[PDB]
Amino acid sequence: SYSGYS
């Protein structure tokens, strides 16, 4: 998964 700001 990805968590945060992109």
Curated annotation (Swiss-Prot):
Entry's localization field: Nucleus
Residues with PTM Phosphoserine: S6
Post-translational modification: Phosphorylated in its N-terminal serine residues upon induced DNA damage. ATM and DNA-PK are able to phosphorylate FUS N-terminal region.
Tissue specificity comment: Ubiquitous.
Subunit structure: Self-oligomerizes (via N-terminal region). Oligomerization is essential for chromatin binding. Component of nuclear riboprotein complexes. Interacts with ILF3, TDRD3 and SF1. Interacts through its C-terminus with SFRS13A. Interacts with OTUB1 and SARNP. Interacts with LRSAM1. Interacts with SAFB1 in a DNA-dependent manner; this interaction tethers FUS to chromatin. Interacts with MATR3. Interacts with SNRNP70 and POLR2A; these interactions couple RNA transcription and splicing.
Disease tied to this protein: A chromosomal aberration involving FUS is found in a patient with malignant myxoid liposarcoma. Translocation t(12;16)(q13;p11) with DDIT3. A chromosomal aberration involving FUS is a cause of acute myeloid leukemia (AML). Translocation t(16;21)(p11;q22) with ERG.
Family, as annotated: Belongs to the RRM TET family.
Task of the protein: DNA/RNA-binding protein that plays a role in various cellular processes such as transcription regulation, RNA splicing, RNA transport, DNA repair and damage response. Binds to ssRNA containing the consensus sequence 5'-AGGUAA-3'. Binds to nascent pre-mRNAs and acts as a molecular mediator between RNA polymerase II and U1 small nuclear ribonucleoprotein thereby coupling transcription and splicing. Also binds its own pre-mRNA and autoregulates its expression; this autoregulation mechanism is mediated by non-sense-mediated decay.
Name of this protein: RNA-binding protein FUS
Gene symbol of the encoding locus: FUS
Entire-sequence positions represented here: 37 to 42 of 526
